[PDB]
Amino acid sequence: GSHSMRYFYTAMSRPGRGEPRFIAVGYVDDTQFVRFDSDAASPRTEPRAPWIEQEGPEYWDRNTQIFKTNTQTYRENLRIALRYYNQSEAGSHTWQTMYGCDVGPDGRLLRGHNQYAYDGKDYIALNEDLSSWTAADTAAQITQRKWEAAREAEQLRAYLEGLCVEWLRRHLENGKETLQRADPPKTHVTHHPVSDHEATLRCWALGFYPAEITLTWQRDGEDQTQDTELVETRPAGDRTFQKWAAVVVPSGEEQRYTCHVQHEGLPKPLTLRWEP
């Protein structure tokens, strides 16, 4: 039912406070399963989800080998970036990278991803054809010709089409009980009088997984986008997520308002209304 594995790398320089820190985390959809931190007492990749723990020591040491190598490569990227942007060695900078493969119900690659950002700004990204690059500026163009000359896209393509999807399929199998289980949101509408003429109707969605969800208020069948307050979906801490949408309505007219909830864990879109 469409899944993806993603790795997020962050490297940050800190002049006067040691070598640049490198942190890596891996996810399958909205479930983190691994982590690596160069700042840990004894840097080693650590499990963050139950199902991954059963992997053998070969997997874990290979992971640590890859991450230690990546740690040094990013320290070099930070040094190289100063040159590309004529920056001083006195400032702190950040390199971020995302890798990922999306797979369809049948397990075949829907698409691969590989993007870089320096100091929070898009730098270079592998195109969807997994064969070319898009550089954001003249420094990234340098990296592009450099990567084209070494045919980096081809090696990345192999990983994205091979190992990535193969391991994702394996993770989905081993973590089936959770990774392939959608938890529908528990929903209810609360009422909060704000004035004698107005009141707040808040539509809640709790304990749902995955994070993707749609909550909307309709006034007589019309969406109240511009007048709806929607908070960013937030993690509960138990793997599930939460979200709410609120609207201020004239006292007495609340029955003209309906809250609509769409989630993949629901047979069909829900419709709620305040029930006094």
Binding site: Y7, Y9, V34, Y59, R62, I66, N70, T97, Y116
Partner: peptide, 9 residues
């Protein structure tokens, strides 16, 4: 397995 980033920018 995580992707190897052996090539610098």
């Amino acid at each position: 397995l995580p992707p190897v980033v052996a090539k610098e920018i």
